[PDB]
């Protein structure tokens, strides 16, 4: 699931 | 729309090992597939176009193969700077669609955190709130425990953690734990302690300070 | 070189519209199409649409009615406007250019605009020093930082000494507090012997509230 704070999948 | 399924969701390897990313399409798409790298806070970076065609300025360790429904992005010898998420894209059928991505994680030797503690600034206290910060720097693996204590009272639920993404140069993580209280409670107590548990320590490390 | 620069990140009220400008250079809009892609928690990477060299537009099926793309070739500008945003439209929006004029292999991307759909108000952060001390020193290495507290919406950028300091910098992912405001810390480790000689400043920039703060960080 994509996280807008890090731009990484979390 | 074409469904693109990437597997697995997480890959974990060590530097120098070969690694492969899989992309499966819901129906044949010939060789119409592109591959992207996304780093922390970055935009996607084009690695390979049309299943196997090289892209200018992209390291030779990246290559792609496949046709039909089953495709593979390969790194022949993984480097620490390859820590990212990877996405495939089909464009045989309108509209162009992307898979959900695979996360690349790197293994390394266990590294104990360096622990630092920062009292709230007088500046922040002027506003009626105190933040006490405990920093765990450059450690591996990710799992660690931070336990706060104010005058031997174990704190619970009044702190938040944040963990950086894996470092691109040394593969370690960093963690910050912020304990938040009012100015009044802060002024009511003396000893502020952050106890850190990690695999690379042979016992818990406590950093503390006396207010004033 | 080829570049795509997007307008600053911003808040959008629910049911209201999103406007982003993509300013390009290194190539002419009359020769290449410009595409729009977003990245959300719910649906990952999602192609939204395109404006071609001649001004024709395509919109991905779910957006044919709420999406509008226009451009000014002479000004090298492409304008994106989407209508009636719900909260699941919170995402990163990118403009992109392909390798060849007709194609879809996106070799050049904008930096991306973080778009937050929320009814709340913008709020600038307060910046507090994380002062180096003996409790933050080890082996002649001191740690020091800045606490960037109580802002909305994301993001804030933080640099050190106006970009000249980057090694040993860790800027933590923002965490949402109970108040609905975000917070983060940025730390750096330096030689302790340089604390009496060097200045350390965190440059904090929160565009949505037009808040720029340089915070000097000193041993206490």
UniProtKB/TrEMBL annotation, chain C:
Highest taxon above the source species: Eukaryota
Q: Which residues carry this modification: Cysteine sulfenic acid (-SOH)?
A: 174
Where does the protein end up? Cell membrane
Q: Which cysteines are joined by disulfide bonds?
A: 146-202
Q: Which residues form the Ig-like domain?
A: 125-218
What's the protein name? IgG H chain
This protein's species is Homo sapiens (Human)
Query: In terms of the whole protein, what range is present?
Result: 125 to 237 of 466
């Amino acid at each position: 699931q994509f996280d807008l704070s890090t731009r990484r999948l979390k | 729309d074409i469904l693109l399924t990437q597997s697995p969701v997480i890959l974990s390897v060590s530097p120098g090992e070969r690694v492969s990313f899989s992309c499966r399409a819901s129906q044949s798409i010939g060789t119409n597939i592109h591959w992207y790298q996304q780093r922390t806070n970055g935009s996607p970076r084009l690695l390979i176009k049309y299943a196997s065609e090289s892209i200018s300025g992209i390291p030779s360790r990246f290559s792609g193969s496949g046709s039909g429904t089953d495709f593979t992005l390969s790194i022949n010898s993984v480097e620490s700077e390859d820590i990212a998420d990877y996405y495939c894209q089909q464009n045989n059928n309108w509209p162009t669609t992307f898979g959900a991505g695979t996360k690349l994680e790197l293994k390394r030797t266990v590294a104990a955190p360096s622990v630092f503690i920062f009292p709230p600034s007088d500046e922040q206290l002027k506003s009626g709130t105190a933040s006490v910060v405990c920093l765990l720097n450059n450690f591996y693996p990710r799992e660690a425990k931070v336990q706060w204590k104010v005058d031997n009272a174990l704190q619970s639920g009044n702190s938040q953690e944040s963990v950086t993404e894996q470092d691109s140069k040394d593969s370690t993580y960093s963690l910050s734990s912020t304990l938040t209280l009012s100015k009044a409670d802060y002024e009511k107590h003396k000893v502020y302690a952050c106890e850190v548990t990690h695999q690379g320590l042979s016992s818990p490390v406590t950093k503390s300070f006396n207010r004033g | 070189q080829v570049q795509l620069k997007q307008s600053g990140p911003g808040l959008v009220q629910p049911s209201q519209s999103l406007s982003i400008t993509c300013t390009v250079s290194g190539f002419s809009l009359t020769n290449y199409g410009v595409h729009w892609v977003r990245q959300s928690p719910g649906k990952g990477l999602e192609w939204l649409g395109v404006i071609w060299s001649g001004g024709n537009t395509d919109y991905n099926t779910p957006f044919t009615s709420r999406l509008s793309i226009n451009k000014d070739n002479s000004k090298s500008q492409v304008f994106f406007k989407m209508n009636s945003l719900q909260s699941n439209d919170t995402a990163i929006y990118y403009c992109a250019r392909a390798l060849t004029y007709y194609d879809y292999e996106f070799a050049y991307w904008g930096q991306g605009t973080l778009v937050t759909v929320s009814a709340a108000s913008t709020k600038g952060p307060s910046v507090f020093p994380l002062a180096p001390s003996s409790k933050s020193t080890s082996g002649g290495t001191a740690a020091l930082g800045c606490l960037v507290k109580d802002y909305f919406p994301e993001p804030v950028t933080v640099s050190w000494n106006s970009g000249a300091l980057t090694s040993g910098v860790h800027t933590f992912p923002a965490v949402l507090q109970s108040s609905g405001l975000y917070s983060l810390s940025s730390v750096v480790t330096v030689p302790s012997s340089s604390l009496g000689t060097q200045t350390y400043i965190c440059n904090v920039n929160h565009k949505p509230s037009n808040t720029k703060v340089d915070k000097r960080v000193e041993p206490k």
